[model samples]
Target chain A: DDLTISSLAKGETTKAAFNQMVQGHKLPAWVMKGGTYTPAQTVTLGDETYQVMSACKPHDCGSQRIAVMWSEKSNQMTGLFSTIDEKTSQEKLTWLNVNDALSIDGKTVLFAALTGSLENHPDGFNF
Target chain B: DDLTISSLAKGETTKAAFNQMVQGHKLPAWVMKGGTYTPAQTVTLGDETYQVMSACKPHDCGSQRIAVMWSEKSNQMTGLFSTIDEKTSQEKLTWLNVNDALSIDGKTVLFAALTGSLENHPDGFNFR
Candidate 1:
C-alpha cells in the first residue's frame, strides 16, 4: 500500500507536505492504541536519528499541537501536527519502508503512512 | 614679496578651503607677525631639530591641516590654530617669516609660509 502523511488542525486533517515528499506513492497501514501512535525505535537517516510521536487530540490542539522530534549528534529538527480533535485522537500507527524512497544522490528521502481512524468520517484518515 | 595666509568664509576674506596653503593670503597682518615655527628644541631626527606650532590650514598643499608645537626639554607638542569664522572672535597672535622657511631631511621646522599661490587656483607649494 502507499503511505500518505497528514496533519490535524482545529479538528481538521490536511495532507502533510514533508511526508508527501518522502512517501512518493507507497503508503503504510494504520495501527490503533490509546489516544496516539508511538513508534517503537528511532528512525535513522545518514548520520542522524529521529524519534517519532503522534497524538490525535489535545485540549490545546487548537494551538498547542502534536510535534515530532529528530536528533543527530547535536543537531535537531521538529515537525508539528495541529488542530487535533476527538475524531483523530483514536488513530493508529503504521510503518512504511522508505529505503528506496531516497534520491540517487542521497540528498533526499520520502516516507509517510496513513493510519486507520476510530471514526469512519469522510476524512477519517486525517491526511 | 612678503608671504601671508588668510581664509574666506562664503565670499568674505574668511579662509577658504585649504586656500590658507598659499594666499590671496589674507590676515590681520597683526596676527601675521611671524608665527613660531620650529622643531621642538629637543626634537632631533638622528641629528636634526623640528619647528613646532599649533593650528594651520592644509588645503591642497599636501601639508597636514594641523600644525605642531613642541616643548624641548619636555619633548612635548603644543600650539594650535583654529579655522574658525572671521566673526568668531578669536584672540590669536600669529606670525609670518620667510627666512624661518624649512630645510631638507624635512623632519624639522614649524609654521610654513604663504608662497606663490599655486597657478591651480588654491593649491600647490614647493616645500624645502
Candidate 2:
C-alpha cells in the first residue's frame, strides 16, 4: 500500500538507513544533492528482495541521475549512475557497489530502474 | 512547443499516420489497442531528428507497452515493444522495423522511450 520511499521505509526507518549510509560514506556524494526522490517498489532479484528508489539532479535531470537498491537480507546497497554525453546525447551507465554476488539478471533490473526513472520521471523532483 | 504526438503530427496528422500504418500491417496489432500515449519529444541521432512517443496496455502497463519514433527526414517509423516475464518480472524489449541503417544510439533512444512510458506514466490514460 506504500507508494513512496519514506512510506516503504516505515516512515523514518528508510530515511534513517539512508542517512546512516550517507554519513558512513557508503553512497556517492551527489546523492545528498539529489532532487525529489522517485517512488519505492519491491523487486525480487535472485533469492533476494530489494527496495529500489532513485532521484535526479533537479536542474540536469534526464541527463544525470542515480538509482539505489537496498536489501536488508544482504545488508548491501547498490547504485547505478546515469549521465548523458553532450556530444552524442547518449546515456552512460555506471554502477556502484555492484559486486560479483549480484546476478546478471539483477544487474539488468537495476539498469532498467535507472533508465525508467530518467526517461519517464524526468520531472519527478520538479514539483 | 508541441508536447504531444498529435500536436507534432499537426493535430490529426500523427494519428492519421498511425492509423494508416496500422491498417497497412506495418506495426504490431497491439498499437491499435494501446492505452494513453506518453508525451512527445525530439531527439537527434546520427544526423537525423526523430520524434518519439509511446503507450501501454491500460490494465497491464508496467508489463507491456510499445514506443514509436518517427523521422520526417528518413521517412521511416521505428518501434520498440516491451513485455515483462511473468516468472522473473524482468523486461524483454523487441524492436520493429529497426534496420542496419539505424545506429546503436538510435536503438537505445527507442528502448528508453518504452521503458519510461511504462515506469513513470503507468496512469497516463487513467484520467477522464
Candidate 3:
C-alpha cells in the first residue's frame, strides 16, 4: 500500500527508535531489530580465527561498512571485506585493503590489501 | 633548497623505486627509506596489544592510509588511528568509528566508532 513504511512504524518498529540508535556515534543499529542487537558472528582468515568485534555502518554511501574481527589467541583485530569493488555490486570500504589491519589504538606497520562483502541484505540496514 | 628531491634521487631514491613499491597491490613503501622499510611499531587499544603487520599506502588524501596491526596473543588484528576529525588536525578514516569493530571475512554485528593518527612525517611517508 502507499502507507507501508509509516504504517510499519506503529508498534515496536517505531521511527523514534531508529532515529535514536542510528543517530548515536558508533552505536550498533539494534534499532533495525526494534529492541535488541544482532549477535556477533565468527569468521577466520589466513591461519587466524576471530570473533565479531564490531560492525561499521556503511560510510555515507560507500563501502567501509564492515565487521571488525578480534582474535582471542593473538589479541588483535581484522576487518572482513569484499575484494569486489563497489562498481561491480560488491565492496569493502574507505581505507587500505581490508585483510591487512591495525592495533587497538589504530597503529601498525601492516598494510591493508583486501576485504569481502555480505551475501544479502537484511532490510533497513541498506546503505 | 628547492633542488632537494631531484638531487636526493641521485643517491638511491630513484623514481622507479617509489613507483614500484607504491603501485603494488599491498606493497609497503620500503622505498620510502631508499630501499628498506620503517619497522612496524606497536600500539594498544582497549586492553588489547598489537604489532605492525602491514602498513597501507595512504588512499590518495584520505584517512584510511594506516598501518595494519597484528596481535601475537590472539592471532587477530586491529588498527591504530587518531580519533580527531580531519578538520581538527587529526584523523582515523573513511567509515564508522575506527575503534568500533569487525570480522576476518567482513562480517560482524560489531560496529566501528573511532580511530587515531600519527606523530610526524618522515620524508615520503607524508599522509602517513
The global C-alpha lDDT for each of the candidates, from Candidate 1 onward, is 0.26, 0.55, 0.30
User: What's model 1's lDDT at A17?
Assistant: 29
Across A12-74, the per-residue lDDT of candidate 3 in tens digits comes to 544443233223234234313233113444443336554442323333323333333345565
Best by DockQ: 3
lDDT of 2 by residue, B1-128 (tens): 33443343343435555443333234334456446576666766546677777777676777777777787656666666666667644355555555555434445556656545323433221111
Q: After superposition, how far is residue A119 of candidate 2 from its true place, in Å?
A: 20
Candidate 3 lDDT by residue in tens digits, B77-124: 333222224543323322211232333211221111112222221121
Cα RMSD to the true fold for all candidates: 34.1, 13.6, 15.0
Ranking by DockQ: 3, 2, 1
Per-residue lDDT of candidate 1, residues A33-127 (tens digit): 12344342244544555444444432332322233333334323233332212332211112122233222111111112111111111111111
Better of 2 and 3 by DockQ: 3
lDDT of 2 by residue, A2-96 (tens): 34333433444455555443342343445564455667667765577777777776766766776777887755666666665444323544556
Q: Supply the global lDDT for candidate 1.
A: 0.26
Instruction: Report how far residue B31 has shifted in candidate 1, in Å.
Output: 88
Each model's iRMS? 43.0, 9.8, 14.1
Q: Tell me the docking grade of candidate 2.
A: incorrect
Better candidate by lDDT, 1 or 2? 2
Q: After superposition, how far is residue B71 of candidate 3 from its true place, in Å?
A: 22
Model 1 ranges with Cα > 4 A deviation: A1-37, A58-65, A84-127, B1-128
